[PDB]
Write a protein that binds this ligand. Structure first.
Ligand SMILES: Cn1cc(CO[C@H]2O[C@H](CO)[C@@H](O)[C@H](O)[C@@H]2O)nn1
Ligand SMILES: [Ca+2]
Ligand SMILES: [Ca+2]
Ligand SMILES: [Mn+2]
Ligand SMILES: [Mn+2]
Lengths: 227, 233
């Protein structure tokens, strides 16, 4: 199977370890986050996510926030060095199940540095209908109002259940030789209920990664099961 | 045929096809016959630096080649990439040898593109090349890793260059160079190179190029063709 490392953001699946509230988390080869923190989600408002990892501290951190609101942050010690392969791909993933929400990405940026220093950086502030430097998987689409819609949305912007989609940057990224990065994304999660599902995530995986069979809902397009 | 826009650093004068009587720098728009050239005082065995810039405002392509202490050689040309190239392209480096040869070693390479349609950007920096550089598409005789360098054309087990060779390296991801409702980018490329020919006669040159995403070495583009063009039209 695939090797995944992710920062996840919406629906509590307590039977699989989640806490009773919306949670922010760090996933290392399992959907059962190694660490989490309370995320006071705001339906229909634009959020920001910041992820950073430095090879010095060997620590992955994430912060999510809304204008004039307190942010949530989670940190976790881990040597990517021993978890992921040398080359990887970076992407955004999201899903819905019985419940849903829009999983709109308004922007996405990324920087990798491997110190003769080698680097990669990309900035997406608008998304085009034919974004060739993105690899869309599943239900993801680009174009609508220049946004990236990870899961299925209707003509009127109404979301749909049982949907899963990812978007991976076309070029592979070198993250280790024996190595820092930063990621940022702006999102819009919106639901007509008051129990959105299932969340969004930034992830790093093997270059050939793809959505696992059946990974909608709680599995967030990332994991084949819940172990 | 592929669509190419390139900046060449030509060590071999091919008089019968427009090369001036000396090593030179040139800008190539869909043909190996440069729209504009400038004399280049190539210094054999010395590390050079090439800088290529393009801005949407001027819509002017420029290039400067240099070495330490010596004076630079520069060339410019006005062109609308929105008119010449497809909207998504791939960027790369290409080189070749023919009856005469030279090493075409790349020590470093970086690229930056900006598209204010506010901006979408792409930047890459290669200060060393690994033996299995997955973010690069190698074509032809091109290899990476040896000395942490990129060798565009074939080099023998003892630091010697082979003739009739050709190779290219392309960045894996496609690059958006024009939107239509946004004439940018807006790009800049830099590479560092080492061309040495144990012969008093080096050939054929190195080039930075932009092409259709599926571009590939045209069969027979050795020598004067620099790995870019299929003929000399
Ligand atoms: C005990 N229990 C069972 C369910 C069924 O939930 C569906 O809807 C959820 C939110 O869409 C998904 O997390 C889940 O994977 C599944 O698809 N909810 N609570
Ligand atoms: Ca959950
Ligand atoms: Ca020539
Ligand atoms: Mn969770
Ligand atoms: Mn020439």
């Amino acid at each position: 199977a695939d090797t995944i490392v992710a920062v996840e953001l919406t629906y509590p699946n307590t039977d699989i370890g989640d806490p009773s509230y919306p949670h922010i988390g760090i996933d290392i080869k399992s959907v059962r986050s190694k660490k989490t923190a309370k995320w006071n989600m705001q339906n229909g408002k634009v959020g920001t996510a910041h992820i950073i990892y430095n090879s010095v501290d060997k620590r992955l951190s994430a912060v999510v926030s809304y204008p004039n609101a307190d942010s949530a942050t989670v940190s976790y010690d881990v040597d990517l060095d021993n978890v992921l392969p040398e080359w990887v791909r970076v992407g955004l993933s999201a899903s819905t199940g019985l419940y849903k929400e829009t999983n709109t990405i308004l922007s996405w940026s990324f920087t990798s540095k491997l110190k003769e220093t080698n680097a990669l950086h990309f900035m997406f502030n608008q998304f085009s209908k034919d974004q060739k430097d993105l690899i869309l998987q599943g239900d993801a689409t680009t174009g609508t109002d220049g946004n990236l819609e990870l899961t299925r949305v209707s003509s009127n912007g109404s979301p749909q259940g049982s949907s899963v989609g990812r978007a991976l940057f076309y070029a592979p990224v070198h993250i280790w030789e024996s190595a820092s990065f930063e990621a940022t994304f702006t999102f819009l999660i919106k639901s007509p209920d008051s129990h959105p599902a299932d969340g969004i995530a930034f992830f790093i995986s093997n270059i050939d990664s793809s959505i696992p069979s059946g990974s909608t809902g709680r599995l967030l397009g990332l994991f084949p099961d819940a172990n």
